[PDB]
Write a protein that holds these residues in place. Structure first.
Motif, PDB file in Angstrom:
ATOM      1  N   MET A   1       0.866  -1.215   0.000  1.00  0.00           N
ATOM      2  CA  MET A   1       0.000   0.000   0.000  1.00  0.00           C
ATOM      3  C   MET A   1       0.885   1.242   0.000  1.00  0.00           C
ATOM      4  O   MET A   1       0.489   2.294  -0.503  1.00  0.00           O
ATOM      5  N   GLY A   2       2.080   1.107   0.573  1.00  0.00           N
ATOM      6  CA  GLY A   2       3.026   2.220   0.644  1.00  0.00           C
ATOM      7  C   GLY A   2       2.612   3.213   1.725  1.00  0.00           C
ATOM      8  O   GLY A   2       3.144   4.320   1.798  1.00  0.00           O
ATOM      9  N   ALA A   3       1.662   2.806   2.564  1.00  0.00           N
ATOM     10  CA  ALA A   3       1.183   3.668   3.641  1.00  0.00           C
ATOM     11  C   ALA A   3       2.258   3.905   4.721  1.00  0.00           C
ATOM     12  O   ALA A   3       2.432   5.050   5.141  1.00  0.00           O
ATOM     13  N   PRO A   4       2.995   2.897   5.196  1.00  0.00           N
ATOM     14  CA  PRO A   4       4.043   3.136   6.241  1.00  0.00           C
ATOM     15  C   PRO A   4       5.133   4.085   5.747  1.00  0.00           C
ATOM     16  O   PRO A   4       5.434   4.103   4.551  1.00  0.00           O
ATOM     17  N   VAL A   5       5.699   4.867   6.682  1.00  0.00           N
ATOM     18  CA  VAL A   5       6.754   5.846   6.380  1.00  0.00           C
ATOM     19  C   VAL A   5       7.742   5.924   7.575  1.00  0.00           C
ATOM     20  O   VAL A   5       7.332   5.574   8.684  1.00  0.00           O
ATOM     21  N   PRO A   6       9.014   6.369   7.415  1.00  0.00           N
ATOM     22  CA  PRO A   6       9.963   6.466   8.580  1.00  0.00           C
ATOM     23  C   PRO A   6       9.382   7.259   9.752  1.00  0.00           C
ATOM     24  O   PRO A   6       9.570   6.900  10.915  1.00  0.00           O
ATOM     25  N   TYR A   7       8.683   8.343   9.431  1.00  0.00           N
ATOM     26  CA  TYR A   7       8.078   9.193  10.454  1.00  0.00           C
ATOM     27  C   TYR A   7       6.950   8.420  11.176  1.00  0.00           C
ATOM     28  O   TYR A   7       6.398   7.487  10.588  1.00  0.00           O
ATOM     29  N   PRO A   8       6.567   8.757  12.410  1.00  0.00           N
ATOM     30  CA  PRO A   8       5.468   8.024  13.116  1.00  0.00           C
ATOM     31  C   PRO A   8       4.101   8.368  12.518  1.00  0.00           C
ATOM     32  O   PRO A   8       4.019   9.114  11.543  1.00  0.00           O
ATOM     33  N   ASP A   9       3.044   7.804  13.097  1.00  0.00           N
ATOM     34  CA  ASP A   9       1.682   8.027  12.611  1.00  0.00           C
ATOM     35  C   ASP A   9       1.168   9.429  13.028  1.00  0.00           C
ATOM     36  O   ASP A   9       1.767  10.037  13.917  1.00  0.00           O
ATOM     37  N   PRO A  10       0.079   9.966  12.446  1.00  0.00           N
ATOM     38  CA  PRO A  10      -0.449  11.313  12.856  1.00  0.00           C
ATOM     39  C   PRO A  10      -0.782  11.373  14.343  1.00  0.00           C
ATOM     40  O   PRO A  10      -0.744  12.437  14.960  1.00  0.00           O
ATOM     41  N   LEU A  11      -1.159  10.226  14.891  1.00  0.00           N
ATOM     42  CA  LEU A  11      -1.536  10.144  16.299  1.00  0.00           C
ATOM     43  C   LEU A  11      -0.348  10.426  17.216  1.00  0.00           C
ATOM     44  O   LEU A  11      -0.508  11.151  18.200  1.00  0.00           O
ATOM     45  N   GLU A  12       0.812   9.821  16.870  1.00  0.00           N
ATOM     46  CA  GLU A  12       2.088   9.931  17.635  1.00  0.00           C
ATOM     47  C   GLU A  12       1.858  10.163  19.155  1.00  0.00           C
ATOM     48  O   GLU A  12       2.134  11.252  19.661  1.00  0.00           O
TER      49      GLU A  12
END
Ligand SMILES: [Zn+2]
Ligand SMILES: [Zn+2]
Length: 87
Positions: A1-12
């Motif tokens: 999906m390519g959804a994961p990224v090095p940065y954390p989630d919006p929730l963090e």
């Protein structure tokens, strides 16, 4: 999906397993100092350091423990280490 990224989630979330939100040092270890009040005796900060951990986790200096924070298990092989111990 390519959804994961090095940065954390919006929730963090501010909280984290790696950082005990209570005493700041039962994360890696067990909830022993959590029961005891830090007010009576605050934990002494470890001046000595090496490898400078990613955050402030003490044991991470020797070997990273990002396994606890990450819900997904690495599934990495135990290898020679973590075995053949005295007990
Ligand atoms: Zn704690
Ligand atoms: Zn750690």
């Amino acid at each position: 999906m390519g959804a994961p990224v090095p940065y954390p989630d919006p929730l963090e979330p501010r909280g984290g397993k790696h950082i005990c939100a209570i005493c700041g040092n039962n994360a890696e270890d067990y909830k022993h100092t959590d029961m005891d009040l830090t007010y009576t005796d605050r934990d002494y900060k470890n001046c000595e350091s090496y490898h400078k951990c990613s955050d402030l986790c003490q044991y991470c200096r020797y070997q990273k423990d990002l396994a606890i924070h990450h819900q997904h298990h690495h599934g990495g092989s135990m290898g020679m280490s973590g075995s053949g111990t005295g007990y």
